[PDB]
């Protein structure tokens, strides 16, 4: 209980950094990421492989809403966590995939609730170590 | 003290020469199976198709016991390369995971070839200062 917390499946209606979502603590220096990583979020699917983010990868996330246009963010669209490249246009924000197989998500803040969970600051790829 | 960073390796100099260490990273080595011994900065996009982008720090377990299909660190005539090992017979090949790169054939009669170790994952962290 002393290192970076590891988040996997996120229930809907429950915060991401909820203790019931936390399934480990990895002893990895935070400041090795810039901004520093606050937690590791296991990535789902292949939407960001073109930048080397694969299913199973632990995305080192800085918890913040301080995210510029162009950066890769962790976002929550109607309770759903997604890791995409950001391009925010007033309250029509476009989340972009890094995989020409997927289409870019437009999310109307008039239609869905949208939260920026934090900035993507790296990945760790370790798999099963026991 | 933690895991050593290893950038480019000068020809004739060994890999883990203190001259080549560009840092120590505080990362639990037993978070990799088998455990990480050093992080090697990957150079180029030959392995992009499994997520190993150019610039990544590949976690590496120091060993020569490498099975085929495994992704390894190899030195072909003083040239460190990360590729997938195809041992199948008296035959051993270095396979990329990038359609624009051809397989590399290792003939131990033409080239000096050492298995530097096993890749047990990557750390993509970039510049932190």
């Amino acid at each position: 209980e002393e290192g970076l917390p590891l988040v996997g499946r996120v229930a809907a209606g429950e915060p991401l950094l909820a203790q019931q979502h936390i399934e480990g603590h990895y002893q990895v220096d935070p400041s090795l990421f810039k901004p520093n990583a606050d937690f590791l979020l296991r990535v789902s699917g292949m939407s960001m492989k073109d930048i080397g983010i694969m299913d199973g990868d632990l995305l080192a996330v800085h918890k913040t809403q301080d995210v510029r246009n162009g950066q890769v963010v962790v976002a929550r669209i109607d309770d759903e966590v997604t890791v995409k490249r950001l391009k925010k246009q007033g309250n029509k924000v476009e989340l972009l995939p890094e995989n020409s197989e997927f289409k870019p998500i437009v999310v109307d803040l008039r239609q869905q609730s949208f939260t920026i969970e934090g900035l993507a600051v790296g990945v760790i790829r370790n798999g099963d170590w026991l | 003290e933690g895991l050593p960073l290893v950038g480019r390796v000068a020809a004739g100099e060994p890999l883990l020469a203190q001259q080549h260490i560009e840092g120590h990273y505080q990362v639990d080595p037993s978070l990799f199976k088998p455990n990480a011994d050093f992080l090697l900065r990957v150079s180029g996009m030959s392995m992009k198709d499994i997520g190993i982008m150019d610039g990544d720090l590949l976690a590496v377990h120091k060993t020569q016991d490498v099975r085929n299909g495994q992704v390894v660190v190899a030195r072909i005539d003083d040239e460190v390369t990360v590729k997938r090992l195809k041992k199948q017979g008296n035959k051993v090949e270095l396979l990329p995971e990038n359609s624009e790169f051809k397989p590399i054939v290792v003939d131990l009669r033409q080239q000096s070839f050492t298995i530097e170790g096993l890749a047990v994952g990557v750390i993509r962290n970039g510049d932190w200062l």
Partner: nanobody
Amino acid sequence: QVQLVESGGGLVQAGGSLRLSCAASGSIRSLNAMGWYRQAPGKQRELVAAITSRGSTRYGDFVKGRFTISRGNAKNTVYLQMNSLSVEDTAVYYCKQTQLGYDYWGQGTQVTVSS
């Protein structure tokens, strides 16, 4: 070569708790990991908890905060504090160690949580 000695299983009434422990004899590298998988009759073997010699920890995705793995003041000994157990947690709980990429199993310790 490593020798793994389980203790602490048995029957528990749902909502109750029970602690498992493992001790690893033999040639133990400084760097290693230990913990528990588990196996319900019929299903496959699942990761429960794991812990490195250096303190890092991982839990299976059913644990949901409920369990806690820790290494003891003892050397090469971990305990798994299982709390809030559910009948669906009834399984055979094998202890596990790797070092250098080779695995080592325990004999198994059965845990029956009853309705």
